[PDB]
Amino acid sequence: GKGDRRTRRGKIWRGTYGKYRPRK
Amino acid sequence: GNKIHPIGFRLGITRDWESRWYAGKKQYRHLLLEDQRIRGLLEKELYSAGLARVDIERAADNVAVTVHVAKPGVVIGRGGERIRVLREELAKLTGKNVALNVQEVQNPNLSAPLVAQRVAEQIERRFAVRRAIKQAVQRVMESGAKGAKVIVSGRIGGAEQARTEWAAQGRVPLHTLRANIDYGFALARTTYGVLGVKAYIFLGEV
Amino acid sequence: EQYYGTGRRKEAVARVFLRPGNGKVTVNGQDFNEYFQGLVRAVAALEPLRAVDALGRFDAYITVRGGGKSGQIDAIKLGIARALVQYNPDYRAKLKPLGFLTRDARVVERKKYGKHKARRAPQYSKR
Amino acid sequence: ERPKKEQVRLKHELERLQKYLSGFRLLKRLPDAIFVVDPTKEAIAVREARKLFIPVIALADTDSDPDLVDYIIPGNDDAIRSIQLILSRAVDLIIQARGGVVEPSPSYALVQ
């Protein structure tokens, strides 16, 4: 969920970006 | 104790800011540390005249430093020598062109920060606090006022039992905005500790 | 020619227009049924137009901007009702009887300090 | 000016002010005496006067204790008959020491 860093929501709630939530 | 500052509460209406200028973010902390350090020496070497306000206005490197006093016969000096060294002490720390107007006091008995100091003193002089309060009130009313309220903190007569002296007359609507109630706070530094004085001179309705 | 209505509700703002004609309806340069596709609430906005009987008499062009995909729909329902009350004085018997006229003062209130969400106070210990 | 608030208010305030003080204006000085119907009724009054040494005249009956009335009018205190007969010739003997002897005063209008 919003705790698993490696997800689309886990990247959102934690206000950071990565391979699993890049900048467009 | 509660009750929000009657000055900060009227600020919207009634009381016009006791320092009304502007300053973008970049510089404000400094015009602030200035205005402040200024009131720091104007309330020391000038209290002998007893100032009850220091308005300060600005625009670009000029300053108002307007001082309101009930006794300006020590503010101007003996012909124009005193204030001559007070526009000097000002620009001494302030690298600007600091002016200095002066208004008087249409009733030191109708100014609160004045009556608050008027009492503050009587306490460091060992006066009967009860009477020094019932008095500093009966002084404001005999002298054209609608309401008066004077409050002393603890250690009256130096008593190890800290009390709280309370004296009022007429009307003092502190929940009202159309109160125009002057207020000011003076201390007192007696040997038996610290004292406190609140001054509630309700002036005009509307 | 054009029939304008002042749509607005809960930080949303809809500018509705009415040119006599087909029946089509547009919102922000996109079909009405395509912009609000998946919202079973959408077709409720055109509800005053079904108590006046004149849906296929008015080609609605709306440009709503601000609020939420639904808050907009509420504002739209005011400007679909307020727009056909202007060009028709007898059409006052659907904006008052069938209450269709109010901005719905139902706005989000301020969050108070010591109140997680304006009213939902924190957890109580006592122990 | 004055919002519709103070108009309803200040009006009412004058209304009642009036309601109770229609006759208690006149002299702004302590009455040299007082005349009263049923003294046991407004004995409160009688007390005031008595505590102030103000002479007291009044029309008391058996309902009322004589002793505490300085000048005593012994007679009916309810039927409007006797009341007018003693109020009349009392206020009549009042003006007969100022001049202006008149006819009786308004009394009958539904007097039985």
Binding site: - | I7, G8, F9, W17, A23, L33 | - | -
Partner: protein, 60 residues
């Protein structure tokens, strides 16, 4: 141990890492506002006074 520190804070002869803030009127290092140069206490204090230009009580 407060006096030496109020001056030790102004003094930036050591790394800019250690160069924190500090309330101007009182030696308060916490709840310092970069804008006013005061802490939460003094801020409220001066604002109640009016010595804070265009700084007014909130009412929304």
């Amino acid at each position: 141990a407060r006096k030496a520190l109020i001056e030790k804070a102004k003094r930036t002869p050591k790394f800019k890492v250690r160069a924190y803030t500090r309330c101007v009127r009182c030696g308060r290092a916490r709840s310092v506002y970069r804008f006013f140069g005061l802490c939460r206490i003094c801020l409220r204090e001066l604002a109640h006074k009016g010595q804070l230009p265009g700084v007014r009580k909130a009412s929304w």
